[PDB]
Amino acid sequence: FHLGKCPNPPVQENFDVNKYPGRWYEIEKIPTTFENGRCIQANYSLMENGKIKVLNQELRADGTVNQIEGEATPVNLTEPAKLEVKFSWFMPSAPYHILATDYENYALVYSCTSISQSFHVDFAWILARNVALPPETVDSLKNILTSNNIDVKKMTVTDQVNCPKL
Template identity: 25%
Template sequence: MRHLQLALLCLIFLAAAPARAATDVVSVPELDIGRYAGQWHEIARLPMSFQNKCVGDVTASYTLRSDGLVGVHNACRVAGGGIESAEGRARRIPGKPGQLEVSFVPQWLTWLPLVWADYWVIALDPDYQWAVVGDPKRKYLWILSRSPSMDRALFGQLRQRAEAMGYDLDALIVSAPVQ
């Protein structure tokens, strides 16, 4: 009887454990931040509270700063036709080229560790024409392109890559034309 109770207890713990992804979330092994800089168009994203008002024309622009950080300018069209934007900065993680941390708090608060969020480039076109960005906890995901639309077959391949890393894309918001 004791063995049966132990077996049932083990089954309960296994059932309650989160499902393991087919592969871990990994960043790209190389990222030339100079080539990555410039404007990107959001093609799709997982829902994020700070993007709730965005209805289209979502862009992210990255610039190299003289202090070694990367300037971040995010913008989107909101209902009524206006544009909302946010200014931030990103910093590289030493020894991890595809991993950055991003913050949108005022500069004087950036010394706090909890104001930096993971920004991992997890898939990248060799010619820097598209990118998939996420985080190790699978809370964030963006599919980005240098152009404001994306080929349907390519979009499907990038979705599959993200799903293979364990991202649940049931709630994925497609924010730009996929043709």
């Protein structure tokens, strides 16, 4: 919960949606809730229209699996790295902005929602193709956030250690 209008960081230049699909593991995020997933992964599959189906899955402490299915749609025709995502019929879409990705190793995703023009809440996820990233990559991605006035101090490391080999 923050003062002012939503930050509007630059997004990934020359973004190629065709190289984005497949499985991404969650490495770090701004937590959305104080409750509980590990081994967090999302599978993206690119459709005919440029819509992207998203299947998010996580393991809970008791070893059960929680899943949610959603769809990402480009918000506009100018900037292919600015999408919006919807997971439930009853939930308005949320921005899904790809700030940086090399398609083969990492992606930084940002989302911000206003609470009037005077306040906002924002979120960010560092994703990877593998279950871990070099500390210097994580640092470089957090620097993007910081340099755009997005706070990284509340970010948590997702447990990719107590997890199956997939």
